């Protein structure tokens, strides 16, 4: 933050000489001086360069032309207005939010003006910077306690080592110095939620419209367990989305609770649909209580809002309808809902309290917004026993917290604050839609096959496009209306291979092939299925990355139609097994893999595998008690029927739990095993296209084993 | 790493010109050239500057004088030897470990020599750098995957914000870029312990003499819970040191186990002594089993080795004697025992396996060595069910691990490796002893009162000085010999106030006064009691810091004897309450606080408070079940007798648990309450000298409340 | 291959300053910067100078006027397009064979952009350079086997002689270093037609529409005799 813009040659020494003296006084204070051509050039310079921290201009020449325009971009931006004798104040000044200092063109005034600019820059920074970070930065820069640990003291210990010196130089001083302890008493304590730490938590809770917010330094994986353990006593019944993150599976292994699963829907693609409205009604739950051994009325419920694929719930409907005292929205996917009105009545925090209920959102701040890994928030809307909740929090938090992680969580909030924050999301929304329109346009214009997007036939509107029963694009049968909506930011592309029905085509290009092509160009794919790929249009995503991906996709088709040798098109793939890939051409590779899917009837097997549930012999907790005594053994996957599984089995595809600890596959549910076996069989043919099943142990000879109770 | 040392003017153009050409070729590659005066100056330059990465010298002039001396400091240091026509190879070369390249003095050879120096520097770096860090650094520097998250991508998202740009600039690029995900597939996975991660874990386990090592990214606070939960099934009995860290108290709240406490000793000062030998004998344990409701034979035992005050156990004695299948040494204080032979048979990992037992050390790598906060190790010696142990590990680890924390844990090992690692600890030991001798010397030489160190009357030896029954310095009665030893690095200083017996003097200077004086000079105190202060002589501690503390101590006495106004000597204290401290002088402050201790008979009350245990009505787990249903209320501290406490109460002093969750103070154990009340009473008089009781809630009016069962 | 052409003064600091910072970052990497007058001057500069390995230009100002014209001369030529906020992608991009990187005008982006230009220049070179020559050049530049012959090793033996030093200097290092043996095992063998040598022969045979091609190192004078002797038994007509 050291670029000052001056706007203009005037052609008079009485004005120019004082500016020359000011240039010299500013260089003495180590400012860089920049000269925008005109008003437009300045506005773009401000818009693109946050380091622009001051503007000098003749008052009469620019004030009536600049003040409103600059206010719109940066309310706080230093203006240094030089007045004429006859300058006056128009009524336009009275109600505008401007930050103006008035200066005269005079020799020997530069020393005082330069000090005022420095002092005013600090006042601007002090206003916009958050309180804890401002204190932290001041300590790191200024402070010198001695007779103190840490013993390394700003990473001093690292510099005494040959490799240590390389390590120190790589990470830098700030990273080393930021590693502090509670010996810095003026910053208070995280664990106590005292001093500046309390100020930080209130800052966060205000920005996100929460009653109270906790900063977690071990990710939402831990945030879920803090909420979960405080909320679910042993021997209680919980309602849990079968579509749950692994951390909730681990929660079950750690807590003595009885799960009753909310049951999602699914289509032919193998994409998960929302928990239908009937799942929340008293009639459905009352019967589930009767059907669960020892079950009582649920004390706590966990709902994933939105779904991974961007299906949002009417949260007003759930809060009003669901007859459970404790409702937890795992909102790790939707931390940005408070920033666009399109999400009204579609987020956990939206609206007011629910009398006699406590409502939670847990959010993974990292890679959902911008924050360091392990940074997570718990947002509470309702009442908790403060002392008891803090005991639960301290039970899972170390006594040696990382102060940078804490600061990064607070600074993540600083990013989303103010008008620049709102203007960021408005920009990302417009770019997300723009890209969707370009895909649909290129699909219409191109000759023969092209990529398509899984969405309404027309998205000429800016909204979370509702799933309508009168539309076939989504491929769900008799969808509930006014229920599930498509988040614009969660973009799913589809590759040729399956019909509109969910029927199989003769010609197909498995998405796995495109994924390998994309890696040659250093493009990450978040999630892939048989014929789909997921991309996340974050705030970091600019027009360059969108065009790079868009052009990269047209280049894939270009090279594909050439029918290049895999050796030439995918050299990194070829290198994996030169003999296997010696004479294979790109079109044969696509046809060969599609043929395996066709022969194995993968889509049909995947549908039938998830249609009937494994039987819950005992709870995951009860089964883990046997495992604690080391009463497990490994069996081949083929010999798992009639055995009690000890681990969760999580196959990719379709990346959702298939078997839980305590469940047993029987003759009734043999299709489950047939799907898993098919994944291991199909996956053995092509180097680089290996099976991927979390919970199964692949042996050197390519046989799989699972753990079961003796 | 860019400083090259050249050693010499020769007075011949045939040698000098080629060196001039080499200087120019090296500057072109951005090396800095340094010229040590002679052999001694070079050795000091190497010793003090790890960035010295090459030495040029005439072979005949120096080889017989340098080779052994340099080998001793740096086995790997580049030598660029310039040969004469008649140079020969003495037998001294044959068995020495040297890294030599031979060059001729010739024009137009510099391009190839310079490339060889670059290539050889990389080969030197490649040899000494650990495998994962070398790959990580190469990725961070070189790599460019696109169509990837994280969305911020090297902190790009931060730069779009005004405050975000300040935040980015403060932390720097490397800190931002190092925030990665598993999308970087070539680095494998932490959670899977695969690829370079397995290589890193084997590197660590080898350096620390463990069977297997796990890297934990939530500190030893979490490492204790991973080991604890895998090790102690519900309804089992554990032996636990009453002198346990808070994380073990939290473990009890989280695990349904029945504690039987090992019972430490204590002296008049209130310093904890070791668990006597009788505590480990079958006779003592057999009776404890009979005395504990529902207890069976202990399945797992936890011992704190060493004690905080540096008492080490004969671990060979414990491993051989203790009839428990699972023994866990919380060795958070002694991670360095593998590096000095003085610790033989005094560490958990020392020696071999114990048939039919599993032995663990958990170590807080940070501030016990040098590593980032939250970095912790679990070391295992024996057999675990690998798949089951990893489930327990994954249950408490996030799905979004911090890659820098992981790298810092590995790099912490890199610091301790090789000959420089051994030469570091040898240096810290010699400095620790040197300081102890200077304190004892100044005590002998000075007129009247001076500081003393709590240790043997003579430490003219380098050893963990054994506590002998024929010595009175330690103030423990009938100490077991060949049992407890004083770690040289753990230095406790004492201030005047109490006799050798543990009797009270008329004159005294409470240590709290000295602690405030030390803060005026930016010296941290790790731990303080009524008349003691603890300092940790880490590897970061140099001779400058030792002298600063030593001089700071003599300055305190100098100013103290002047009897300066507190307003002048302790201006920051005076500012806290100008009216209270207006006319008070330093000697009156010391006398006034000592008088409160004398009147309140603090030492006597503190001894009696810990003599009789609160009664365990129910386990901390059973009591927490009632708290989960919100069946707690707050009572004044004064009204706690006959109530079931809900929280642990941890008073400072003496910083050890006084009451546990589930325990009840009765008329039998009223002294416990009297001590706590005395702490609140004595603590109310002096601003800056407030009561400090974790577990008690101080109200605005200075009344305290605790939580109890209804 | 080190001449970069930049096309234009814009009259705005927000665009010009970032280009100044880029000029400095590029000079640090030892690039020469050249400034063609206009589109025609650029096209002639490209046409006449194969060492032109990159072009910087404002996207909106030139893309619709340049992309087809440049594609016609050099499919592979680096373009460094600087975008405006409102820049869009016309259908003309979809089927054209372009090699585009999109950059923003921003301070402190030059280090990464300059590295991308270096990395992209290598990717361009790697695409157009033949496989064996690319490996050979990399060996000659990078490699250092010891306990090896030839004994002269990069013509070292020549430099020990008065006339030898004149001979070495006349022919140069590359000519001397290129004199290798089969000790460089990663290049395979000519006689065996193995490894990169087989790759080279297939490259040739493809370009000349042959079933199989052999590389002869004693001219067609010998090529005629190889074919002739294999083809004509004694006592035949």
Q: Is A551 on the interface with C (CB under 8 A)?
A: yes
DSSP string of B69-92?
A: HHHHH-TT--EEEEPPTT----GG
Say if the Cβ atoms of A156 and B367 lie within 8 Å: no
- In this structure, the strands spanning B32-34 and B3-6 are parallel
Q: Which neighbouring-strand residues pair with C84?
A: none
Candidate from A1, A51, A156 with C-beta closest to B540:
A156
Cβ atoms within 10 Å of B544's Cβ, excluding its own:
9
- In this structure, the strands spanning A300-304 and A326-330 are parallel
| A310 contacts A341 by C-beta, under 8 angstroms | no
d(CA B669, CA B677): 14
Residues of A in contact with B218 (CB under 8 A): 217-218, 222, 398
Instruction: Please compute, for residue A292, the number of CA atoms within 13 A of its CA located in the half-sphere on the CB side.
Output: 22
Handedness of CA B116, B120, B121, B123 (dihedral sign): positive
Q: Is C90 on the interface with A (CB under 8 A)?
A: no
Instruction: Please compute, for residue B169, the number of CA atoms within 13 A of its CA located in the half-sphere on the CB side.
Output: 14
d(CA B696, CA B707): 8
| b/e sequence A431-450, b meaning 16+ C-beta within 10 Å | bbbebbebbbebeeeeeeeb
Distance from CA of A346 to the nearest CA of B (A): 24
- Please tell me whether the peptide bond between B139 and the residue prior to it is cis, using omega within 30 degrees of 0: no
Distances from the Cα of A436 to the Cαs of A432, A545, B331, B422, C207, in angstroms? 6, 14, 58, 62, 42
d(CA A384, CA A358): 8
Instruction: Please compute, for residue C141, the number of CA atoms within 13 A of its CA located in the half-sphere on the CB side.
Output: 6
Q: Which two tokens stand for residue B354?
A: 């114990």
Which regions of B455-545 does DSSP assign to beta strands (E)?
A: 465-466, 485-486, 490-494, 527-528, 532-536
d(CA B432, CA B424): 12
Closest to A1 (Cα-Cα) out of A38, A23, A29:
A29
**Cα angle B270-B276-B282, degrees, rounded to a multiple of 5:** 145
Touching B: A residues 10-69, CB under 8 Å: 50-51
Place of tokens 């009632």: B626
The CA-to-CA distance between both ends of chain C, in Å, stands at: 56
Q: Which neighbouring-strand residues pair with A240?
A: A261, A302
Secondary structure of B108-140 as H, E, C letters: CCHHHHHHHHHHHHHHHHHHHCCHHHHHHHHHH
Q: Which two tokens stand for residue B47?
A: 């010793």
d(CA A98, CA A89): 13
Say if the Cβ atoms of B159 and A518 lie within 8 Å: no
Cβ atoms within 10 Å of A315's Cβ, excluding its own:
24
d(CA A78, CA B402): 38
| B398 contacts A223 by C-beta, under 8 angstroms | no
d(CA C215, CA C206): 14
Provide the 3-class DSSP secondary structure of residue B239.
strand
Q: In this structure, what DSSP letter does residue B565 have? A: B
- In this structure, the strands spanning A237-241 and A300-304 are parallel
Contacts for B136 with CB less than 8 Å, ≥ 6 apart: B178, B187, B403, B407
Contacts for A304 with CB less than 8 Å, ≥ 6 apart: A241, A243, A244, A245, A329, A330, A333
Q: In this structure, what DSSP letter does residue C214 have? A: -
d(CA C26, CA C121): 13
Interface test with A, best of B162, B374, B635 (most A CBs within 10 A): B162
Closest to A3 (Cα-Cα) out of A27, A38, A39:
A27
Q: In this structure, what DSSP letter does residue A585 have? A: B
Place of tokens 């890199």: B414
Q: Which two tokens stand for residue B211?
A: 């069977």
| A531 contacts A508 by C-beta, under 8 angstroms | yes
- Residue B113: closest C-alpha in chain C: C144
d(CA B145, CA C230): 54
Which chains form contacts with chain C, at 3 or more CB pairs under 8 Å?
A, B
Contacts for A122 with CB less than 8 Å, ≥ 6 apart: none
Distances from the Cα of A164 to the Cαs of A70, B50, B413, B417, B420, in angstroms? 48, 9, 10, 11, 11
Q: In this structure, what DSSP letter does residue C183 have? A: T
Q: Which two tokens stand for residue C143?
A: 């490699």
Cβ atoms within 10 Å of B388's Cβ, excluding its own:
18
Contacts for A508 with CB less than 8 Å, ≥ 6 apart: A495, A496, A497, A498, A531, A590, A594, A597, A598
What does this entry list as its resolution, in Å?
Answer: 5.5
| B256 contacts B235 by C-beta, under 8 angstroms | yes
d(CA A247, CA A634): 24
Residues of C in contact with B144 (CB under 8 A): 116, 119
Distances from the Cα of C106 to the Cαs of A480, B153, B156, C61, in angstroms? 48, 16, 12, 18
Distances from the Cα of B657 to the Cαs of A4, B291, B332, B654, B696, in angstroms? 59, 22, 19, 9, 13
Q: In this structure, what DSSP letter does residue A694 have? A: E
Closest to A4 (Cα-Cα) out of A496, A28, A237:
A28
Distance from CA of B329 to the nearest CA of A (A): 19
Determine the distance from the C-alpha atom of residue A185 to the mean position of all C-alpha atoms in its chain, rounded to a whole number: 34
Q: In this structure, what DSSP letter does residue A235 have? A: T
Distances from the Cα of B52 to the Cαs of A389, B74, B76, B112, C16, in angstroms? 54, 10, 11, 21, 42
d(CA A550, CA B498): 80
Which regions of B476-619 does DSSP assign to beta strands (E)?
A: 485-486, 490-494, 527-528, 532-536, 615-616
d(CA B608, CA B266): 11
Candidate from A174, A388, A707 with C-beta closest to B171:
A174
Q: Which helix (H) or strand (E) holds C177?
A: helix C173-177
- In this structure, the strands spanning B300-304 and B465-466 are unpaired
| Alpha helices in A323-474, H assignment, sequence order | 386-395, 403-416, 418-445
| A518 contacts A495 by C-beta, under 8 angstroms | no
Provide the 3-class DSSP secondary structure of residue A356.
coil
Asked how this structure was determined, the answer is cryo-EM
Place of tokens 């996975």: B189
Provide the 3-class DSSP secondary structure of residue B6.
strand
d(CA B524, CA B522): 6
Q: Which two tokens stand for residue A196?
A: 């500046």
Q: Which two tokens stand for residue A316?
A: 């007003």
Say if the Cβ atoms of B219 and A158 lie within 8 Å: no
Residues of C in contact with A552 (CB under 8 A): none
d(CA B615, CA B642): 10
Which regions of A61-203 does DSSP assign to beta strands (E)?
A: 79-82, 100-103
- In this structure, the strands spanning B237-241 and B300-304 are parallel
| A582 contacts A567 by C-beta, under 8 angstroms | yes
d(CA B519, CA A143): 12
Phi, psi at A611, each rounded to 5°: -75, -35
d(CA B166, CA B708): 48
Distance from CA of C37 to the nearest CA of A (A): 22
Q: Is A188 on the interface with C (CB under 8 A)?
A: no
d(CA B595, CA B585): 15
Cβ atoms within 10 Å of C133's Cβ, excluding its own:
12
d(CA A630, CA A256): 19
Question: In chain B, helix, strand, coil percent, each to 5?
Answer: 40, 15, 40
| B234 contacts A625 by C-beta, under 8 angstroms | yes
Say if the Cβ atoms of A543 and C107 lie within 8 Å: no
d(CA C20, CA C56): 12
Touching A: C residues 68-87, CB under 8 Å: 83, 85, 87
Candidate from A36, A543, A551 with C-beta closest to C14:
A36
Say if the Cβ atoms of A147 and B524 lie within 8 Å: yes
Phi, psi at A380, each rounded to 5°: -120, 135
The torsion of the CA quartet A78, A81, A87, A91, rounded to 10 degrees, works out to: -10
Provide the 3-class DSSP secondary structure of residue B705.
strand
| A201 contacts A214 by C-beta, under 8 angstroms | yes
Cβ-in-10-Å burial (0-12, 13-18, 19+) of B333 comes to buried
Handedness of CA A609, A614, A620, A623 (dihedral sign): negative
| A685 contacts A596 by C-beta, under 8 angstroms | yes
Q: In this structure, what DSSP letter does residue B241 have? A: E
d(CA C28, CA A255): 60
Closest to C56 (Cα-Cα) out of C96, C16, C86, C29:
C16
d(CA B657, CA B649): 6
Q: In this structure, what DSSP letter does residue A30 have? A: T
| B643 contacts B689 by C-beta, under 8 angstroms | no
Instruction: Please compute, for residue A106, the number of CA atoms within 13 A of its CA located in the half-sphere on the CB side.
Output: 11
DSSP string of A297-354?
A: S-SEEEEESS-TT-EE--HHHHHHH---SEEEEE-TT-TTGGG-GGGTTSSSSSS---
Cβ-in-10-Å burial (0-12, 13-18, 19+) of B242 comes to middle
d(CA C64, CA C71): 12
Cβ atoms within 10 Å of C196's Cβ, excluding its own:
19
d(CA C20, CA C14): 11
Distances from the Cα of B600 to the Cαs of A349, A684, B667, B682, in angstroms? 53, 79, 21, 7
Determine the distance from the C-alpha atom of residue B375 to the mean position of all C-alpha atoms in its chain, rounded to a whole number: 11
- In this structure, the strands spanning A532-536 and A300-304 are unpaired
d(CA A35, CA B365): 53
Touching C: B residues 128-157, CB under 8 Å: 144
Cβ-in-10-Å burial (0-12, 13-18, 19+) of B445 comes to exposed
Distance from CA of B76 to the nearest CA of C (A): 20
Phi, psi at B666, each rounded to 5°: -115, 180
Residues of C in contact with B103 (CB under 8 A): none
d(CA B162, CA A129): 9
d(CA B113, CA B212): 44
Closest to B244 (Cα-Cα) out of B371, B332, B315:
B332
| B181 contacts B351 by C-beta, under 8 angstroms | no
Closest to C7 (Cα-Cα) out of C52, C51, C68, C74:
C52
Provide the 3-class DSSP secondary structure of residue A644.
strand
Provide the 3-class DSSP secondary structure of residue B325.
coil
| B77 contacts B125 by C-beta, under 8 angstroms | no
């Amino acid at each position: 933050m050291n670029i000052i813009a001056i706007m203009g040659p005037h052609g008079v020494f009485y004005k120019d000489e004082p500016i020359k003296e000011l240039e010299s006084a500013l260089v003495a204070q180590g400012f860089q001086i920049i000269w925008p051509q005109n008003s437009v050039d300045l506005l773009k310079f401000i818009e693109h360069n946050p380091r622009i921290c001051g503007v000098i201009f003749d008052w009469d020449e620019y004030s009536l032309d600049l003040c409103s325009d600059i206010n719109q971009l940066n309310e706080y931006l230093p203006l240094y207005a030089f007045i004429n004798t006859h300058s006056t104040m128009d009524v336009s000044v009275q109600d505008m939010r401007m930050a103006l200092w008035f200066f005269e063109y005079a020799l020997g005034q530069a020393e005082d003006i330069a000090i005022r600019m420095r002092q005013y820059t600090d006042e601007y920074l002090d206003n916009i910077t958050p309180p804890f970070t401002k204190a932290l930065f001041t300590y790191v820069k200024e402070r010198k306690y001695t007779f103190c640990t840490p013993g390394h003291m700003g990473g001093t210990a690292y510099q005494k080592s040959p490799v240590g010196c390389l390590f120190y130089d790589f990470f830098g001083g700030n990273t080393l110095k930021a590693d502090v302890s509670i010996s810095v008493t003026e910053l208070g304590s995280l664990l106590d939620h005292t001093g500046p730490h309390l100020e930080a938590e209130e800052y966060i809770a205000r920005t996100f419209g929460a009653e109270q917010s906790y900063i977690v330094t071990n990710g939402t994986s831990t945030s879920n367990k803090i909420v979960g353990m405080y909320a679910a006593p042993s021997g209680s019944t919980l309602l849990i989305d079968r579509n749950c993150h692994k951390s909730l599976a681990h929660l079950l292994m750690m807590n003595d609770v009885v799960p009753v699963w909310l049951k999602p829907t699914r289509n032919a693609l193998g994409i998960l649909g929302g928990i239908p409205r009937r799942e929340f009604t008293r009639d459905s739950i009352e019967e589930k209580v009767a059907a669960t051994t020892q079950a009582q009325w649920p004390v706590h419920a966990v709902i994933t809002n939105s779904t991974y694929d961007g299906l949002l719930y009417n949260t007003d409907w759930i809060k009003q309808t669901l007859d459970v005292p404790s409702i937890h929205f795992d909102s790790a996917w939707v931390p940005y809902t408070h920033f666009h009105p399109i999400y009204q009545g579609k987020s956990g925090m939206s609206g007011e309290r629910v009398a006699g209920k406590v409502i939670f959102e847990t959010q993974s701040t990292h890679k959902m917004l911008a924050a360091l890994s392990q940074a997570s928030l718990i947002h509470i809307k309702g009442e908790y026993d403060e002392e008891a909740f803090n005991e639960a929090f301290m039970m899972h938090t170390t006594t040696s917290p990382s102060y940078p992680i804490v600061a990064s969580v607070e600074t993540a909030a600083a990013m989303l604050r103010g008008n620049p924050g709102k203007r960021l999301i408005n920009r990302s929304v417009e770019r997300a839609l723009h890209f969707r329109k370009e895909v649909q346009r290129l699909r219409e214009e191109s000759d023969g096959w092209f990529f398509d997007i899984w969405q309404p036939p027309q998205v000429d509107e800016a909204e979370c496009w509702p799933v309508a029963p009168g539309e076939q694009w989504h491929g769900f049968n008799d969808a509930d209306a006014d229920h599930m909506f498509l988040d614009p930011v969660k973009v799913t592309i589809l590759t040729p291979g399956m019909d509109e029905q969910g029927n199989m085509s003769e010609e197909g290009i498995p998405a796995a092939l495109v994924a390998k092509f994309l890696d040659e160009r250093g493009i990450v794919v978040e999630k892939t299925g048989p014929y789909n790929l997921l991309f996340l249009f974050s705030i970091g995503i600019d027009k360059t990355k969108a065009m790079g991906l868009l052009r990269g996709l047209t280049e894939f088709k270009r090279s594909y139609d050439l029918n290049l040798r895999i050796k030439n098109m995918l050299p990194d793939l070829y290198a994996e097994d030169p003999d296997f890939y010696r004479n294979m051409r790109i079109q044969d590779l696509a046809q060969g893999i599609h043929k395996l899917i066709r022969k194995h009837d993968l889509p049909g097997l995947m549908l039938r595998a998830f249609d009937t549930l494994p039987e819950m012999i005992m709870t995951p907790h009860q089964a883990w008690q046997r495992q604690i005594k080391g009463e497990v053994e490994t069996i081949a996957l083929e010999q798992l029927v009639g055995r009690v599984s000890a681990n969760m089995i999580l196959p990719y595809p379709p990346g959702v739990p298939l078997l839980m600890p305590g469940e047993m596959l029987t003759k009734e549910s043999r299709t489950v095993l047939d799907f898993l076996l098919m994944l291991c069989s199909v996956g053995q043919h092509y180097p680089g296209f290996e099976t991927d099943i979390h919970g199964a142990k692949q042996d050197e000879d390519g046989v799989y084993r699972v753990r079961v109770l003796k």
